[PDB]
């Protein structure tokens, strides 16, 4: 969650340190398995880039 013990509280807050890690592995797994109608890679419609 922290780079070594150097966690970025500014960006991760240590809160999304773990959440970001999870979402990344799940989308990559479902997508890896196969395009599903709800997501189907970049078939998801106009998700605002935001960030």
């Amino acid at each position: 969650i922290s780079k070594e013990v150097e966690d970025c509280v500014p960006v991760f807050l240590k809160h999304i340190a773990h959440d970001i890690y999870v979402c990344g592995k799940t989308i990559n797994l479902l997508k890896l398995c196969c395009p599903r109608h709800y997501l189907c890679w970049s078939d998801v419609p106009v998700p605002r880039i935001s960030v």
Binding site: W41, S42, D43, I49
Partner: protein
């Protein structure tokens, strides 16, 4: 993009200089009358590695299949025409080309399979073997 638009929507590869990712080998000289190599599905329409655009590397394999399938009906004289030819423009942050390559790819496989399962009907030939 203009070269890919011809290859995806028709089997033509004008490519006057050798630049496009797909290349057409003249394997008719050895395999003709008897398609000894069944070259069309083997080494007639083959791929190039160092001439892949690096943004289309995920669709790289599909492109070849998209266009090769067009030829084996464009070879037998049954007219094969894309319902609409949609133009494609480079873009950043918005992969709209991805959805179009797929919309064309799916029509390509669908047309060849439908013609094969009704004309040159494979189901009956497979029983009478």
């Amino acid at each position: 993009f203009e070269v890919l638009e011809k290859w995806i929507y028709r089997g033509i590869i004008h490519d006057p200089y050798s630049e496009f990712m797909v290349e057409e080998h003249e394997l008719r000289k050895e395999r003709i009358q008897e398609d000894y190599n069944d070259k069309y599905w083997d080494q007639r329409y083959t791929i190039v590695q160092q001439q892949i655009p690096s943004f289309l590397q995920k669709m790289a394999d599909k492109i070849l299949s998209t266009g090769k399938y067009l030829n084996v009906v464009r070879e037998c004289g049954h007219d094969v025409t894309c319902p609409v030819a949609k133009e494609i423009i480079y873009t950043l942050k918005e992969r709209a080309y991805v959805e179009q390559i797929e919309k064309a790819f799916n029509y390509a496989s669908k047309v060849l399979l439908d013609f094969l399962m009704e004309e040159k009907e494979l189901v009956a030939h497979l029983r009478s073997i």
